[PDB]
Design a protein around this ligand. Structure first.
Ligand SMILES: [Cl-]
Ligand SMILES: [Cl-]
Ligand SMILES: [Cl-]
Ligand SMILES: [Cl-]
Ligand SMILES: [Cl-]
Ligand SMILES: [Cl-]
Ligand SMILES: [Cl-]
Ligand code: NA
Lengths: 260, 249, 254, 259
């Protein structure tokens, strides 16, 4: 099942969409400069692009490290991004009351992994009618995603994207099960599946190999963070990186699926 | 480090404290029936007791499934449990705004495991000054608990309990690392550590073996949800009394 | 099901048996010296004791680490240990052809974890008729142990001990599932289950807590690869294990 | 580091090599039939090829279960494969004494995953001087592989292939950590790393997606079994390999990018 996001077609058999951006919105000018670089590189390579940032990063290393600009100023900045670049945007919500104001501005609203079973939030998100990105908790299996999906459907919203971010593998370590992509496709009605490579690892050097492995399984999109300069990609390496992802994606998508 | 909760002393070298009650509050009458039963059994066995219940089911099977009595009704029921029996109570909080009102009534406020790293909730809970029970996320190592403890300390609250509830072990399964109790005691200043045997399990046949194994490591309390409770606690008390009767090697 | 090992009764409802000694046999004199210490401490506490050592260790940390005195001298040392102390002994075997001669002297023969599925060794071990200690691989679930038990039963030997050593938990880390003990008892006909506490340890400092946790689940024995427990803390350690085991074993199963 | 296996160059920046065959040797006629299919398909696809089979299944669930033709019959069958097709072959060895006899005939000898820590088998295999395939145990980390490599090096053999086959994930389940390939290359001197997709899997349907994911990380080879649950149906080999070759060719055509 495909989802239309303005003029973008998101689907497991369409050219991959980059959900790309930064961790926390904490500025106007710098946000715009980083977005500008994403837009320039993705336009150059012809890759559909959705800008990502959180306005409230609620799980930070220290309690007084900056949470971000917050909802009201964050939405102002997202409005500027859309008016300048003409692209869709994505951001996460944390409480039901945020869902309406965020959804009026942002094309995709995201359910944080740690809140993915919070029924009140799921219902409030569903009722916006907005496209939703569901972050898969590291402690949840791929077959258990249908249960979150069912809840969204019961509440009247089937415009859902499932986002892989790795699975707990012993202490303080994540593994990405490449077989989980297929399980999610087969058990949740072939909804768009995307891959958060940034939150799947702890080391920067391995991002390309891990991203290519995931995209080899035939996915709707790649979800990453960069920094203007730990796992975030150096922004200057974006073009070299995306050249490789596009190469593989273009190959994989050009062939029809082979049933075993 | 010991924590005083009314007349109860909670600490890793004190007689274990039982935390128990219901999953979700359904009514005042059934709440008082269950709590009276725990009080009766724990009293005759001589085990300190803190009544546990949540006023809200945050995760529910259907979007239309029953959701508990909610904050206002829930706090009313707790107020009366405290009146009737004169025991401390414990409940979980999910939103920062809930903390101060819930903290007025409930002696211990609990940080859900799913929300353990949510900075806003940590600060709001700390600010109440109440005793706090920190559920260890299944995806978090014992040595990383010190970072959550550090946050509560920066926010000015050191009346902290650490609560084991198992660790992710492949898909859809939990294992309890019995070595994690000692690592938490060693790295988090010997704060009270308790064991949620119920949410560590899958099936109930194994609750006794698991509870005994955990309490053999020398813990402040046990957290759970024929007279099976009685039979169970007789055995836990025997082991706890033995373990705590020996000097720490 | 209980297993008689000379004058010892080994079983999940009997006083726990200690299995311990040295890693590899080198000399009669040094073996007797270490064994004598275990015997004295265990006799002082009234704990049954089976002396353990390898005569030919096949899974050494380095290729040129000493393998042990070998089969011939190793069995002579075992004979002397049995004659001097009047206790049973246990050793590992990794070659089918070794099983018969080793079983002539050693009361319990042990199947290394890494050979646990090797049919030829299982068959040769079973055919000795001796008591066998099955070391559970860290990658094998407790419900899969019944298949190993089945292969021994097919080969005509039911005198089996199941030895827990922890399970793989991500990378370079082991966890002991305390629920696995009960699963092995229920699925494997209540064969004696013993706990190799040393294998999964991060640090020697944690041995006591981990040993006590496992023994709380009601087990036939405790197995030491003694990180290693310092032999001078052995008495104080065993005082605590016996305290717990005596308490648990004295109460009838629920 | 590359490894020459007769005319084949095996290495992490070379065209992938297929290590392909069957579970166990059952008879000569069946073995030649299957091998002939592998050879015909790989030759026309231009994929280097090494035939795989075990001569003994040492760990079956029943002591009565069928175990294969055995060592003596097995080696004879391997000789006929090498004569008929002129390709290298690979088989596993479970006991030290079998190593030199097996290595006379079999170009690559394989250390079984279960026996990784069997020090006498390591030494016996190393002494043969043959190319060695090390099956990565499900219970060993990619950074623990250096320890086995070290032993082989101490024993005087550096022609080692590292073969991923998944990692233990809870009970009775495997997960392949796609980051482990990189860790092995970086910590074990860039020895050839290959991927056993077959023993990594519980379910047949997923073999192509998993194989593609692994090969996307830039590998020396793919290791797989066919049948005429997890083994690939033999008739699908050509279509399967068309896809694997397409990806490998793409990945290998772009320079390595550091991050
Ligand atoms: Cl995110
Ligand atoms: Cl998560
Ligand atoms: Cl959790
Ligand atoms: Cl093992
Ligand atoms: Cl041993
Ligand atoms: Cl194989
Ligand atoms: Cl393995
Ligand atoms: Na919108």
């Amino acid at each position: 099942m495909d989802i239309k996001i303005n003029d973008i077609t998101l689907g497991n058999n369409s050219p991959f969409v980059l959900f790309g951006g930064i961790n926390v919105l904490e500025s106007l000018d710098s946000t715009l400069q980083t977005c500008a670089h994403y837009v320039e590189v993705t336009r150059k390579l012809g890759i559909p692009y959705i800008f990502k940032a959180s306005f409230d990063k609620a799980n930070r290393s220290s309690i007084h490290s900056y949470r971000g600009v917050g909802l009201e100023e964050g939405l102002k900045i997202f409005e500027k991004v859309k008016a300048e670049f003409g692209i869709p945007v994505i951001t996460d919500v944390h409480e039901p009351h945020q869902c309406q104001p965020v959804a009026e501005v942002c094309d995709v609203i995201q359910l944080p992994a740690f809140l993915a079973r919070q029924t009140d939030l799921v219902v409030a998100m569903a009722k916006t009618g907005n496209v939703v990105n569901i972050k898969k908790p590291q402690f949840l299996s791929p077959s258990q995603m249908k249960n979150i999906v069912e809840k969204f459907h019961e509440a009247g919203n089937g415009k859902l994207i499932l986002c892989e971010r790795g699975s707990s593998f012993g202490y303080d370590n994540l593994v990405v099960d490449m077989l989980g992509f297929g399980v999610m496709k087969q058990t949740c009605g072939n909804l768009p599946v995307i891959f958060d490579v940034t939150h799947s690892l702890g080391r920067r050097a391995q991002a390309l190999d891990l991203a290519l492995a995931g995209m080899a399984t035939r996915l709707a999109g790649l979800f990453l963070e960069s920094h203007p300069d730990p796992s975030a990609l150096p922004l200057h390496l974006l073009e070299d990186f995306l050249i490789r992802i596009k190469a593989l994606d273009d190959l994989i998508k050009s062939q029809p699926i082979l049933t075993i």
